[PDB]
């Protein structure tokens, strides 16, 4: 149950991770950083009680009805960030929602909400951040820094702004997500069994 404990989990699933992210990644740091997002993603999913086997299968209604679990997922995630790197020591709070809009933008669009009314919903959830923390946060996704290199000198983006950003490079992020999508699985496996030993 404890934060260690937790980025211990993570850790071992990242290394279960990062042989078959490298067979098709070649970037080997990015592939080192996909390995271990991905791990602690799935570690926090399930300890904060996604049931991420049924988001595949949901419909948006029920993604919506699970908002509040991923909000507890982002804490998680970012907590466990800070011990397995050391570098989110700052705000949790404004961190954690940050992240957290990441794992439930994919759900919706797994569910089968269109990709724009997606967007804007992530709009709508990091609707208190200022501009500028929102630049600072997304500029620690190496996912969306792949996607859109732009970031790296926006000193300031606002909710709307972000939700543009996301569309005008939807296809590259669609790639993106397809190719977590499975790790994040095995990984939300690897942690349910892990955790409940
Ligand atoms: C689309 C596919 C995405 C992938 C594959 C992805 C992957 C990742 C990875 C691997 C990390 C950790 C980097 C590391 O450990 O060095 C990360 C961090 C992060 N991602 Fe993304 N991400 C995606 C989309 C998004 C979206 C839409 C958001 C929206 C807010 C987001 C927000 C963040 C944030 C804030 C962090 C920083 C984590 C922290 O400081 O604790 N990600 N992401």
């Known amino acids: 149950g404890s934060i260690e404990e937790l980025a211990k989990i993570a850790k071992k699933i990242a290394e279960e991770l990062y042989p078959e992210i ?3 990644v070649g970037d080997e740091e990015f592939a080192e950083k996909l390995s271990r997002g991905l791990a602690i993603a799935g570690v926090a999913l399930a300890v904060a009680g996604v049931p991420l086997e049924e988001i595949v299968k949901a419909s948006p209604e029920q993604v919506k009805e699970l908002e509040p679990l991923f909000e507890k997922a982002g804490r998680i995630e970012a907590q466990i960030a800070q011990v397995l790197t050391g570098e989110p020591e700052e ?10 809009a990441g794992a439930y933008f994919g759900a919706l669009v797994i569910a089968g909400v269109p990709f724009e009314e997606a967007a804007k919903e992530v709009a709508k959830f990091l609707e208190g951040l200022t501009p500028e923390e929102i630049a600072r946060f997304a500029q620690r996704c190496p996912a969306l820094v792949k996607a859109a290199p732009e970031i790296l000198k926006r000193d300031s983006i606002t909710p709307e702004e972000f939700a543009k950003l996301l569309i005008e490079h939807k296809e590259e992020l669609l790639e993106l997500g397809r190719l977590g999508l499975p790790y994040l699985l095995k990984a939300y496996k690897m942690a349910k069994e892990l955790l409940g030993s």
Request: net charge neutral; hydrophobic share 55%.
């Open 22 to 24: 490298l067979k098709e």
């Open 91 to 100: 705000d949790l709070e404004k961190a954690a929602k940050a992240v957290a």
